[PDB]
Structures are given as C-alpha cells and as structure tokens.
Symmetry: D2
C-alpha cells in the first residue's frame, strides 16, 4: 500500500456534500488540511494550481520505476556499463529531500541547519564517528551548490535511488578502484561529480527528449491518479473566485493529462453534463518556467491550441475566453485576474519552486501538496508509541543532567525511522526535524496529502494556527 494507493482509494469515494458528513470527514488526519499560519479562506479570490504531482499525481512505485528504467537505459546508451540494466527500482530506499554530496558520493539527510542526520555511501549507512572523517563538524553548507544537490522533488526519487545504485556498483565492481572523490578505471577517472552530472542529464533527457511522456500517456490509468471529485472542487472554487493553471509543462502534454483527469461521464457532480477541462479555468498558462516565473519570468506568448504550437510574437492583447498563455510571469496572473498576492492561494507540490518562491517573491498564500503524506500519516499513527517513547527518553536524559542508556535513544530512533523506509521519514529522523519539515512549516501556509481536502471545508472557513511567542515572551 503505497502513498498513491491511499490517494486512489480516497479518490474512488464519491463526495457526500452533506455538511455534517464533511465536518466528520475532515476531522480524520487523512482528509485534513493542516495549518502553519492562519488563513481566512473568505479572503482568497483566486485559486491557482500546478499540474504535475498536484492535479496529476503519478502512481507509485510504477511511475518512479518507469523514470528509473528509462534513465538507466539512457546512461547505458551513452556508454555506462551493461550491468546497470540489472538494477531495479526499489521504493523502500529513497526518501525525498536528501542531499547528494558530489565530492564524496554520499546521500545525506540533514536538518534545517545542515547537521547530518543520516549519511549513506551507496547502500552503506555510515555511523556517527565514521562520518567525522569526511564531515568533521557533522555539518554541510547546503547553499554550496557547486558541491551539494538537494533532491527535493518527486521527480528526483528515481535518481535518488540510482545515485546510490551507481556508487554501490562501482565500489563493488573489481574493474574500478574506489578513491575518495570517485573511481579509477585505468587511465579514466570518474569523479562522483561527473557521475552525478551524467545522471542529472539523463533524467532531464528522459523527460524532455526521451519516451517518458509517450509511455505515460499511452497508459494513463497505470500512471495517473484520477478522482471524480476534482471537477466538483474546481467548480465550487469558481463560484467564489477565479481559478488558474500555471504549469511548467507544455500545452500538448498538459492537454493529454488534464483531459484524462476530467474524463468522466459527468461534469462537477454525477448526473451533470461533462465540460472540457479548460472551462474550469479563468486563465491557463503553460511553459511557466517556475521559479523564474516569480521574478522576471519570460515573454508572454499565446498557444495555438489547434496545433499545440506557439503563435509567433509576444502576446500584447487582453484576457479572453479560450486563450491559452505560455511563459509570462506571476505579474501576468495578477494583472489579468485583477488580483493582489494575498488574494491568491497557490497550490503545488514543489517546496522551492512553487511554495517558497511565490511566498518570498510575491507574498502569495500557499498550499503545499505532499503526496507521500497519505502514507507517512499512517506510519505516524500506527507507530506513535515509538515516538512517545523517544520523547520520554529525551525528557528523562535531560532531567538526569546510567547515561550510556542513550544508545536506547539510538536504537528506538533507528526502529522508528525504519518503519518509513531506509532513509526514514520525509519529516524527521527520530526527534530531529529534517530541512524539508522546516521548509514546510516556514513557507506552506497550509499543507495536506492532497488539495482535494479543501473540498471538506466551507469557502468561508478560517484556518487557525497559534501565535508564536519568543522565549522571553512565554
């Protein structure tokens, strides 16, 4: 039961819009919207969406495995060894948000301050004192982008695993000699950095030049979650505000995916005429190039929706019905919809490109979709005795001012973390929060396993979070 299995199970349920049913339903963690800062829904005049992993949630592990297979196949085509073909995607290894260290070839899980929580070299999990040799302060400077790459998108899950597979393969393959910064194959030296760059290039190639999109669209039921409540929620939003799409994908792919997402024998509710996907949006913008979108953006272009090609020239005209935009900037949205930033709720899955940047650059209100949360929540609840023991142990140890029973803290930490996978929870390792967790709290005003959870609150709902006080104020 993957996170997408949870989501698709919830998706198959029809909406009971009886108000008592709704209030009961959202009380359950799985159908809940979680709140980091208060948000009066009544003040939202525009609801904006990302597509991939927001409206179109790709099924797991099938989609990751396809991405993996095609990336491997690309590496082999450019000359990586044939043994790569015997790799197979393993959903139990990667957790999202890990940092690849290109100097030493390690996957690192870090807290918000760059402190090392976990360090794996290939599939070898490096214990504390062993990590000191390479990380003397058990710390990385994560903004060193020449050295560190943060794998924080769901598209990065296959490469997260593939990096580890590669390091493991080269390390254990007798043709190569392991060195601190890469591998020696006679008169060739493959640095972890060049290896990392080849992988990044292959993932990009698969998405943009290869067969990933083709293979996705020829079996959308296998690869894409579908939910008849989507048009219900979007039609409700359109009654109280304006609705827009701003996606990095191109028009042709967007059209295939969105058409599938709305392909039911009905419109918003059962019994109603089907309406085309485009009719749910006051503004549709493709090729958005987020996060550049939230600064200067790119020139505004118009899509010829018949050919799927761009019309030649910059589009200088007004918002009209049936127009599809390409490129532009977040100011295009504000200007054409007559909105200020705080009137906008933008809904997406990219913690950096969607949520952090829209908040910091423009003051948009933010809703972060976290697909894995559908399953992380089940683990959090099922294993809460483990976390509470860890809390009591931390309390007890601190009150003590028999301390070598803090190896008990290491053991419980490991057991808890393993319930989530080899790289633990998205949100923490034991009692320590990840960078990702901290970013979620700081930049996502609201978050949930799916944006569909908004359906269970009225549009006048006031989402509340407690005020923060400084220690000297408390």
């Amino acid at each position: 039961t993957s996170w997408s299995d949870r989501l698709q199970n919830a998706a198959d349920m029809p909406a009971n819009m009886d108000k008592h049913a709704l209030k009961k339903y959202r009380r359950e963690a799985y159908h809940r919207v979680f709140v980091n800062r208060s948000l009066a829904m009544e003040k939202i005049k525009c609801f904006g969406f990302d597509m991939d992993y927001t409206l179109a949630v790709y099924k797991s592990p099938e989609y990751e495995s396809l991405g993996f297979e095609l990336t491997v196949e690309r590496l082999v085509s450019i000359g990586y060894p044939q043994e790569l073909l015997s790799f197979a995607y393993d959903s139990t290894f990667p957790t999202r948000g890990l940092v690849f260290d290109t100097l030493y070839g390690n996957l690192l899980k870090v807290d918000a301050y760059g402190n090392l929580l976990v360090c794996a070299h290939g599939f070898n999990f490096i214990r504390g004192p062993e990590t000191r040799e390479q990380y003397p302060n058990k710390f990385i400077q994560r903004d060193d982008t020449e050295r560190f790459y943060i794998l924080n998108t769901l598209f990065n899950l296959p490469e997260t695993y593939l990096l580890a597979c590669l390091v493991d393969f080269f390390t254990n393959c007798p043709r190569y000699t392991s060195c601190e910064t890469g591998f020696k194959d006679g008169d060739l030296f493959m640095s972890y950095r060049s290896m990392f760059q080849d992988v990044r290039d292959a993932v990009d190639w698969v998405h943009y030049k290869g067969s990933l999109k083709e293979k996705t669209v020829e079996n959308l039921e296998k690869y894409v979650v579908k939910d008849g409540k989507l048009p219900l929620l979007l039609s409700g939003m359109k009654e109280v505000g304006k609705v827009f799409l701003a996606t990095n994908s191109d028009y042709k792919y967007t059209d295939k995916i969105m058409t599938y997402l709305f392909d039911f024998p009905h419109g918003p509710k059962p019994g109603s005429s089907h309406r085309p996907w485009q009719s749910y949006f006051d503004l549709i913008l493709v090729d958005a190039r987020k996060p550049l979108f939230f600064g200067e953006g790119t020139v505004l272009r118009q899509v010829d929706t018949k050919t799927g090609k761009l019309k030649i020239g910059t589009y200088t005209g007004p918002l009209q019905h049936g127009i599809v935009y390409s490129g532009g900037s977040s100011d295009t949205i504000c200007d054409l919809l007559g909105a200020k930033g705080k009137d906008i709720l933008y809904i997406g899955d990219h913690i950096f490109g969607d949520i952090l940047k829209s908040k910091k650059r423009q003051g948009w209100r933010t809703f972060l979709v976290i697909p894995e949360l559908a399953q992380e929540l089940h683990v959090w609840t099922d294993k809460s005795s483990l976390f509470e023991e860890l809390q009591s142990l931390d309390i007890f140890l601190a009150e003590l001012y028999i301390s070598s029973i803090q190896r008990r803290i290491k053991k419980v930490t490991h057991d808890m973390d393993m319930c989530y996978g080899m790289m633990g929870s998205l949100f923490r390792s034991g009692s320590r929060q990840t960078l990702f967790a901290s970013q979620v709290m700081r930049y996502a005003d609201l978050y949930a396993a799916s944006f569909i959870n908004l359906l269970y609150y009225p549009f006048s709902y006031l989402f509340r979070a407690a005020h923060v006080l400084m220690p000297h104020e408390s």
Copy 2:
C-alpha cells in the same frame, strides 16, 4: 531610564558567586539567558566575542546622539542645507530593524514575510488604506537590495532617525517640491535613493574618517558601559575552554576600548592583581571583515602591537603568545584553536554578520546580545495586561467566525506599541512578530540583554528548549 542605564545599573553590582544566589538571580528575566535551541554548555570548548555592542556597549542616547550630530555635520559640510543643524537626536523615534524604502522614502516595519506592519513617511504614520497606493499587497520583497535597506544594527539608529528628519524637512520646506520618488529644487532633483546614499556615506565617513572614534575615546565614561564582572566571566571561561576576540575594528581602537573595559584596580575578582586585557584571550583577531570572514575571508596578517600597524606580508606562522592577527577567516580560528564549529559559542550583537552567517556558513553555536532588551523587558512586564487583552481579543474575534469591534484591536495595538516608542517594539507590532524577532528565533541559539548573564549559570548547564512538532504531528 534607557536600556544602557539598565545595563550600567546591573554592571555596578559586584558578583555574588554563591551558587544559591546565582540560581535566584538568573530566574529574573533581566539576568536570564533565553533559549531558542537546546545547548549543552559542557560541549562548548571555545567562547568567541565581538567587540562593539557586545563587550563594549555604547551608552544611550549619548552615543547615538554623537553619531547623529557628526553625520549631520558631515552632510552640511558636503552641501546639505544649514537647517539640518537644528535637528536633534530623538531616542523615542527609531526602533532597530526598520527598512528604508529608497523608491518612496518610507521607513517600514515588516514581519518575517515582508508584510507591512508600520509605514512612516518622515514623521507621518501612514494608515492602512493610504499605504495601498504605494504597496498594493502591503508587502515588500526585502531581498530587493537595490531598493530596500534594512537598518538592523545599533550603529544604524542615528541614521534611522536622520532619514525621517530629512524626509520631513524637505517635504515641509517651501524651496522644494515633493514628488513620488524625491524632491525638486528647480533644475535639481534629489531622489530619496541619492539622499539615502548620501546619509549612508556620511555615517561611514564619520566612523572611518571623521572624529567619532576620537570623541569616543576622549570620554569613555560618558560613552561606554563598564562592568567589573567582565574579567570574572572571561577568566571562568578560560578555565573550561579557550577564549577569542574576532572584531571588525582595528587594533588601535580595539586596544583603547578593551583597555578601558578592563581598567579596574583588580583582575578577575576584587583583591586580585590586574592583568592586561590581552591575557584573557587565547586568540585575538582584528580587522575581521565579518561577514566575509565566514566565507573566504581575507589574507591573514599580523599586527605590530607596538606601532599598531600591520607587518608587511601574509602571516604563515603558528599561534603564539602575544601575537595579534588581522583579517583571515573563521577557518583561521578553527585551525589555530583546534576547534570544530559546534565546539564554538560565538557571542555578538549583529543578527546578520555575527549570528546568521556564523550559524549558516559554519554551524557555530550562537549567542545574540540584544542591548535594548534590558529596557524592552521592563515594558513587556509593566504592560503585559495590554498584550493579554490583545490575545483575548484575537481569540474572541476568531471564535466569532459586532466584528467592527476589531477597531478595538487596532487601538490596543497602538497603545501597546507606543509604550515602546514611535516605531514600537523591536520584536512585534501588536500580535505580529517582526522580521527581527523571527531572525532571532531562527539563528540565535541563545540570546540575552547582555552576555554577562552567562555568569549566572554553571559551565555544565544544559540550556533547554522544547522540541518543535509539525501541525500533523501535534
């Protein structure tokens, strides 16, 4: 009773080192160290210090007023009008951490997300709807450094007031015509930006080329807080670890100030031989150029302590007794003291240059000194009924889902804020936290009105803060 009056009153008290006396004393807010993240003092092996506004706290408002007067005098010397000479520093106007908007000539108090809390044009406090014309989303993008300047140091207090004085003067002086982005004086146009740049240049000039240092050192009792407990605390630190100085000031100024700070007829405790200031430090580094110090830094140089001039060439030798360093980098400290970042507690007042950068770039532990806290705390406690009313009002309004009694929320917000000054508390406007507050919580592991408060805790003390949980974990 300024914040420095509080500090000097506490400074005049001799240290009672009876352990029961210490435990009683630190319980009081004023003598307390506040904790944002847990810190085991036992793990600190090096204590590092900034000088200005950390070890040498300048007396208020006298020091600000001297800075103001000399900056004004400099502007007049380069050709600003004679009327500037009738300005006089007013400590009740500026609060630290405001943003000068160089496009429209406004001082802005903002939250952590760039939302406007207060907007003043000269001495005119612009109410909510009036601010929308210039700030349609009541929001600034604070990283727009071409437009916005964050006045976050205590050295910036005089210029904070002076900017407002200038805008007020030009606005009301009939020789000039007020325009949206500056002032017209016939065939001359003075933009707020050029005006701001002249002020910045004059403040710098006063500190580096003018008479500020000279006038400071000729009356140190008037300008500098002095506390006989300083050598006691530093000698205690030296018993359990190493002690260092890393200051942006030059050797000659540092020597004058530090000599004064240690000028008592005794050493660490009453009755003990006086020792020179330098003897309290295992490493002394001047001309540090923080925050560049925490990245590449500059070449390491040696001071000829006899002349106060730099020796010619890069210093390539070891740490030795009596050597004084100039320039270098944070790695110089780590290397010469045999320390890792988390073994270091760095103590300073610059939220950006000392605390944020040392934490983010190197993983140092941080202690932020906040001089104004000595007085903010007195206001917070004296006026806590006002804040609690504001809390109950916010609760009551939210539970309501007679709402026009949220003008009561505006009124109480204003009354509370005015107790601190015209620009309110350093840490909040009503129930909304400032950018500065948020930075303190995120980057200062510990903070206090003075670093001297460390004297009241044993060096094995475990400072504790509660673990943070995400909303879905709570």
Copy 3:
C-alpha cells in the same frame, strides 16, 4: 563559377613537385600564400587543423542552399507562415561578415571602427542620409552583443540571406504592420530581435538535431570539395613536424568526412598504398569547443572509436597511438606534443574562434583559410581598372582641397562593389576596408584561398612582410 568551383578545379590537378614548377605555380595569386607578418616555416614544429571549411570545404551554393532549405523548413514547423517555403537561396545577396542589427532589422557592412559602409533593410539598400535617422553618427558599437550579431562564418551565409528574406516578407505582407523594431499581427508583436533569435535557434537545430549532417554524408560528392593533394601535403608536414586535428565536430561526423577526404586509390602520392586518415595525425581531438578551447577548455575525454561514444571519465593517461581525444584545451595539445605556441601553425577558417583567439590567448602562429578568396581574387584582377580609377579619383579630390564630382566616387564605388555581389566584397566597399579585412590583417599571420597552397613552398620557406613604421618614423 562559384568560389568552390575554383577550388575544385585546382583540386583536380595532380601535384607537380618539380621545384621549378612549384616556384612558377605559387607566383600566381590563386596558388599563393599571402603574408601579414613574417613567418619562418623552419621554426614551425606542429601543424594544426580545423575541419569544417578548412580540410572539408563545402561546395557553393549547394551547401548553403541545403542549410537554407532546412532552416526554413524548421521555422515553418515551429509555426512561421507557409510563404517561407517559396523562398530560395540566392548566393548573389549575402557577403560574409555582415552585422545584423536586432533593434531595427538591418544588415550592416561596417569598417574596423564600426562606421556604416552599407545598410540594407530586407532588400532595400538604404542610402546615406536615410541611414542617419536610425544611425545618427553612421556608427555602431559592435561589441553591444545584446543588439548586434556579427555573421562572420560560412555557416552564417544562409541565415544572412534568410534574415533579409524575412524582413522583406513581413514588410510586404499585408497581414503585418511594419513598426520601427518589428511587426504587428493584431495582438502579437514580433520584434526583429525575437525573429533573429528564432532564426539562430533554427540554424543551430538544423546542424545539431536536424537532418543537415545526414543529408551531407549521403551525398559527399555534391557537398564536399575533394583533393588528392591533401595527403601529399599532410605527409610532407609529418616529415618535418607533428600534425594535429582540433575540431568542434564530433567523432562520428569527423570520421565520415575525413574518410571521404582521403578516399583515393592511393596514399600521399599516386602509386602509394592508401593509409587511413587517422594515420596522418599525431593527435586527433574532437568536440574541441573553440574558442573556449583556448582558455579553460573542458575536461579531457577519450573517444571509444569503435562505438563513437565517449568513454566514461576524464582521460588521465599519455598520448598513445590510435587514441582519439574529446574536449580538453589548447594546453592539452602543447603538453602532449611538447610544443610552445610559436612552434605551432594553426590552420582554420574561423577568424574569431580559430585565428584571433589562438593568437591572442596563446601566441600561436596562424593561417587563415578564406574560401571565397578563390573567386574574390578573380574579380579583383578582372576589375582592377575600376579600383585604380577609384584610387585616382580619391587622390584628385584630396589635392583639390567641381567637388560635386564626388558622386562619380559614389558611382564607381557602387559599380565595383556590384561585381562581387549585392553586399560587395568581403574585404572592402570601394576604397574602405571592412572589419573582416582589418581582422584578417591583424590576426592572420598568413592567409590564402586554401591551405593547400602551402604545398607550393618548401618547409624552410621564410614568408616575409615589410616592417611597419609609425608616421613620425616614416
């Protein structure tokens, strides 16, 4: 009779290596090497070559026309109008080295100082006073690379014509409204800059992603000059020094082209065994990325010559027989061949990327191949009475200190220029030298219509140019 017709006629002649025959032959302008700075051939220890338009000279106008057709087809595929398909390449319009002005959509021929010699908007040649409106000083700042693009390669000939075709088409097509900086098609505005960028992108696409290479290699006799004297010259060079190839092309294309260039039933001379092309080179380097090659370059890689793919990793080994390199830098050549810059004669056609950069960055000796010279020389000689009249007229006008017979100077200038084509000589407009001419003189130590002309001088030859004197020295 195109310039390539001249070259192929000369190519069909077998080499008479009788020394009297050689001395007679090189006296003819067509078989001559021209000298800008003295060069003792005896001091050259390495002869280096570019491939495209140096060893492999593409036949004209067939190759340009193929490039044109495929570029047009690409533009139409991305949505340019169908009328583009009725364009046909016209070799009489473009001259190499023109500057496209992206602001106003003009092709400009300029002197070395940026003074306008010719200005065409589409096919409208703009006379002197008319050009002043857009060019008030009849001058461009050619290093303004955001605005001006210098079309100085032979690959740029088709786009040179296509830019003019496009400007002419849009101007005369009633669907569009001509504006100063581009064209209006209702709510779309196509700037000359965006148009230029689409053309540049399409040319690149055709070369790298499209069918140009495929179509070239399937009819090499149609598209590529071939000369049995090539291996004779290269084998002679190998007797007195080392020989290398440094090309921006990839291995697979290089191999197809070079194999064709050496495909005769003999080796160096008639009657000798054929040898593979690779055997003529002490070092072969592909994917050179000139001109970046002459600074930092890129990492050195090794080609798997069996697959045509790169081996994985950086190549760290020595020069060995049969190895093919990829990437690297000019230092790779120097190091592996044991050469200093002045020991190297580098032979290429790219005035910037080959000749200027190798000279300026490394001090290499330079031989510029200028394919069009084979025909320009015929015009220069056939029409020399016109140029001499122009000289006498310039003399006579200056001595005069009836001046309106300087329209005679304009007329003769026009008649002379038209003998070369609509954009005149590569090297001048009337008595004014082009930028290209000036670059040739300043950076090409030697130049010729073909590098094959070296065959006619012994390898001890001292090429001589007169010393330059300043005016006060003369």
Copy 4:
C-alpha cells in the same frame, strides 16, 4: 634636456601667425601633427580636452620625483622598511607602457601580440634564454588582469621605477629570502602581488588623500608647463566650433591649474584683455570618470563654483552660461552641444581612457598627446644611422635565407635602445614595435608631442594618411 624642457622651450616662443611662417614651422617634426587616418578639420565642430598631461603638462623629472617621494613616504608610514627613504627617482630607468607581472615580479616591455621584448627583475635585465624558464613561449596574455598590470599613463612613471627599486631592495637585503613569487621574512611572506597592490594603493592615496595636489599648486612654475599660445589656439577653435573640457579632476584642482595656465597679462594674443579660463569653454565637465564616462557614465551633477562643492541632486536643466557640470557621460556632451561623434575631436594623453574608449565606444575623432615625443623625436633623428643599420641588417639576414652575425643585430638593437633609456623607446625595441606604438596607430587618428601643434595648420586643413591595402591587393 627632458621632454618637458623641449615643450617649455617651444612654449616660450610667441606665435607668428603669418601663414608662410606657419607652413615652414609645421614642416619641422617637433611642431608637426602626425596622421594615422585622414581627418578633414573642416568637419570638426567640437574640440574637446582632457586636463592633466594634455592642457597641464607636468614638468619632468620634477613632477615624477615628487610623486615618487610621496609614494615612498606613504609606504614607510604604513610600515615598509626605512631603507626605502634612501631611494631617489631616476628618470633614465622607466619607459611608459611596461607591464608589471605580479606573479614573478618583472617589468616587461611587450609588442602588440604580447611577445616579450625586454624583461627586468629589479634592475637585472634578463636575457633571452633566461626568460624562457618563466615565459616558455616568450609571451604573456596581457588581458589576464589578475596577473598583469599595464603601466600606460604618465602618472605611472614613478611607480614603474618604484616597483623595480623594491624588487631590487628585497632581493639584495639579507633579512629576506627571495622566492619565485615573492619574499620570505620569517613567518611573513610578501608576494610580488601584495607588494604591487600596496604600491598602487599608495600612489592612489598620494593623489587623492595625500599632499601631492597641495605641493603642486604651491609651486606651479616648478611643476607645470605654461604657454601663452594656449588661449590663442582655444580662441581660434571657438571661432569655428565649440570647445569643451572633460576631466577626471575635481573642480577645485581644475580651477587652480587652469587659472595658472591662463595667467598672462593678456588674453588670446598679446595686447588683448585677459579673460577667465572658463570663458574659453562652451561646456566644462569635471569628475568625468573616464573611461566609464564613455559608457553609462554617472549621474549628472552641477558644481557650486563659489564653494567648489556639488549642489545636491541630479541636474536636469539646460546648458547655460557659467554652469559647471560634474559626472554625466559622453552623451551629455553630444546632447548639450548638438554634436555627433564624428563632429568631435577629443584631445588627450590617456591611450586607453581617452583615446581608445572614445573611438571604440562612440566613434569620436581622436588626437593623442604624447609628451615624451618631444624628446623621443630628438633621439630618433640624432640616432637614425643606428636604425637604418638595423634595417639593412634585417634585410641582409632575410636575403641570406655567417648568420651568427645576428648577434650584430642584438648589439645594434641594444645600443639604439639605450639612447632612449634603460627601458628603451616608448615605441619600439630595435625593429620591433611596442604594444603602445600599435595602440597609437590603431586608435589615435592624429598625434603629436603637444596639442599646440594644431595652431600651425589652418582649421580647414585636410590631414592625410595613405590608404591601407591587404597583401593580396598590393
């Protein structure tokens, strides 16, 4: 007899404006204007001037020696050794335009292609084979500005000598150990680069913060050439066009110097009323910041000529009588004088900042003043037998195809060069032209020992240079 002695001798002569006298006078090399490209004076509508070393020629070696002494004194004040005080400026050592190599501490004289003509380490002239160790290709990449500094202004003459003095001193002083890249003094390492930077900083300091200007203006007769023909030439220019001043100096210094330059008991000619210097200029611009002036420049400001301070704000008004400008750009000149670039003759001594940049960035006509030419010409003529022998030797050697009598070429080269000084002629070493010579020819349309030489040609004069032909055109 220094170059300034020549200039002052010519300056003391009154102008005989009889037209036959003028034609006779300009025929002499010393009073001649030399021509690199033809220039019809009749088309010049604006004559523009630099001040320092153009209008105000500083006397040699007195001015250089003052600059030297004060720079030395500054270095000693910041802690260089006392032995520096025994240095004394020696005019026979430096030639202008040398390159300081900061890696190895050498002064280099180079040709236009970066080939080494002369290499001195301190006062040790390094012969050919010895230079190969550090310069394997006897070549530098002169645009490597991190490594190489081109000393091409007359203000750079003292530092040129001082660099050599320093290298010589440290090398021969037993307290220091000479290393490849600098000097070791125990635990201090002084790199040639840091040494060079200290010298550069001291020269700047002397000019801007020190006593150089003060000492200059208190003895203007000792330090500044003065010529009563200056106002005659400028008044003549004003009859046929407009006249402007664009200087990097500030108003106060400009006023002192210009007042002195016009301090005669007469105006343009003897017997005429004296007029203030400002009356000779249609536009006066100070603080020009050339060469940034010829791109974006800086904001346009107005000088309060009473105080010598800038008025506050950007000057937005028109050109008016008595206004003095500060900052701005070359476009300010064009706009306010109603001129295009080719209508402007700009007259200055800075080959880069005045002449190259005005020509390349704006297409201005250029007149380069070369103060040393007044004496170089005397050497060129007095020693022309030496140069002619060198020419005949070069001819004879080349015709030979007894070659070890090219040591005769080295000997004559050395003897010729020594007549000019230890670093030879500004314009050549033997038969090889310097970088400076090449820049003069390429960017100075006209040049001369003094701009006063324009007085000897009528304003309708057509200055002629021969057309350039390519080798294949000749």
